[PDB]
Amino acid sequence: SVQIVYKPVDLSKVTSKCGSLGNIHHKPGGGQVEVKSEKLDFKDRVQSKIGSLDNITHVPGGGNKKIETHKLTFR
Amino acid sequence: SVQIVYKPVDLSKVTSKCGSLGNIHHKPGGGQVEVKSEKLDFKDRVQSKIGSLDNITHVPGGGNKKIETHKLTFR
Amino acid sequence: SVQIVYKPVDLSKVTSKCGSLGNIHHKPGGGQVEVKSEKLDFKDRVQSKIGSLDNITHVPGGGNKKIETHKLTFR
Amino acid sequence: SVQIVYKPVDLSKVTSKCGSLGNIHHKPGGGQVEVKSEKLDFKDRVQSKIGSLDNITHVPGGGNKKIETHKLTFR
Amino acid sequence: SVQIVYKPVDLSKVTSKCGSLGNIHHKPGGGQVEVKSEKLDFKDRVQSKIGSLDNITHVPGGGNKKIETHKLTFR
Amino acid sequence: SVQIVYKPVDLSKVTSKCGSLGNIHHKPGGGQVEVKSEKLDFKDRVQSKIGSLDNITHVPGGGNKKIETHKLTFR
């Protein structure tokens, strides 16, 4: 016969104090984008992008990530 | 015969203080985008984008992510 | 006694042929203008301009200037 | 006694042929202009300009200037 | 007694042929201009400019300048 | 007594052929200009410029200058 026991335990305190978060700035693609094209011959899929794209400005006043995982297999 | 036990336990306190979050700015695609095109011959799918796109400005005054997971298999 | 004579003469033909004037373009101030200002103290005249201004696009299909002048003094 | 004579003469033909004037372009201030200012103290005149200004695009299909001048003094 | 004579003469033909003027381009201030300023103290006139300014794109399909001048003094 | 004679004469033909003027380009101030300033104390006139300025792109399909001058003094 089989006897199995699991006792995970945690208290942890993942913390982040700030007195004053200030004055973040972000200027992607300030400048000028130009794209000329003549006599182009494609015989398959095309994807294009031009300009400012996919620009993130994440500012988590927190941003305290915490993660956990627990597997327990038996055959 | 089989005897199995699980006891996960947690108290954790994922915290984020700020006194004052201020003054975030974000200027994607400030500048000018131009795109000329002449005598183009496609024989398959086209996707295009031009300009400002997909610009995020996430600002979680919190942004305290927490995650957990628990699997328990038996054959 | 005094005897004075003036005989200016001209035929000149100031010419400009074009077969086809085409396709002029002009994009001033394509981009973005921003102007922040805090705690400014003036004790005299101010002039300001912001943006697109005073942009000319002269296109004289002719533009044949001709000029002449004639003074004739006596004391 | 005094005897004075003037005989200026001209035929000249100031010419400019073009078959086809085409495809002029002009993009001043494509990009982005930003101007922050804090705690400034002036005690005299201010002039400011920001942005695109005074941009000319003269395109005289002709542009044949011709000039002349004639003085004739006597004391 | 005094006897004075003037006989200027001209035929000249100032010419400019072109078959095809094409495809002129001009991109001043493509890029990005930024100007921060803090605790500035002036006690006299200020002039400022920021950005694209005074940009010419003269394209005289002709541009045949011709000039002349004639003085004739007597005391 | 006095006898004076002037006989200037000209035929000259100042010419410029082109078959095809093409494809001129000009990109001043492509790049980025930044100008920070703190605790500046002026006690006299200021002039400033920042950015793209005074950029010419003269393209005289002709550009045949011709000049002449004639003085004739008597005391």
From Swiss-Prot, chains A, B, C, D, E, F:
Species classification: Eukaryota, Metazoa, Chordata, Craniata, Vertebrata
Positions bearing the site annotation: Not glycated: K7, K13, K17, K27, K36, K39, K66, K71
Modified sites of kind Phosphoserine: S1, S20, S48, S52
Subcellular location as annotated: Cytoplasm, Cytosol; Cell membrane; Cytoplasm, Cytoskeleton; Cell projection, Axon
Entry text on domains: The tau/MAP repeat binds to tubulin. Type I isoforms contain 3 repeats while type II isoforms contain 4 repeats.
Omega-N-methylarginine: modified positions: R45
Range covered out of full length: 622 to 696 of 758
Protein name stated in the entry: Microtubule-associated protein tau
Cross-link (Glycyl lysine isopeptide (Lys-Gly) (interchain with G-Cter in ubiquitin)): K7, K13, K17, K27, K39, K43, K49, K65, K71
Residues with PTM N6,N6-dimethyllysine: K7
Glycan attachment positions: K43, K49, K65
Sites bearing N6-acetyllysine, chain numbering: K7, K13, K17, K27, K39, K43, K65
Disease: In Alzheimer disease, the neuronal cytoskeleton in the brain is progressively disrupted and replaced by tangles of paired helical filaments (PHF) and straight filaments, mainly composed of hyperphosphorylated forms of TAU (PHF-TAU or AD P-TAU). O-GlcNAcylation is greatly reduced in Alzheimer disease brain cerebral cortex leading to an increase in TAU/MAPT phosphorylations.
Annotated consequence of substituting S16F: In PIDB; markedly reduced ability of tau to promote microtubule assembly
SUBUNIT field: Interacts with MARK1, MARK2, MARK3 and MARK4. Interacts with PSMC2 through SQSTM1. Interacts with SQSTM1 when polyubiquitinated. Interacts with FKBP4. Binds to CSNK1D. Interacts with SGK1. Interacts with PIN1. Interacts with LRRK2. Interacts with LRP1, leading to endocytosis; this interaction is reduced in the presence of LRPAP1/RAP.
Tau/MAP repeats by residue range: 2-32, 33-64
Organism: Homo sapiens
Function in brief: Promotes microtubule assembly and stability, and might be involved in the establishment and maintenance of neuronal polarity. The C-terminus binds axonal microtubules while the N-terminus binds neural plasma membrane components, suggesting that tau functions as a linker protein between both. Axonal polarity is predetermined by TAU/MAPT localization (in the neuronal cell) in the domain of the cell body defined by the centrosome. The short isoforms allow plasticity of the cytoskeleton whereas the longer isoforms may preferentially play a role in its stabilization.
Recorded superkingdom: Eukaryota
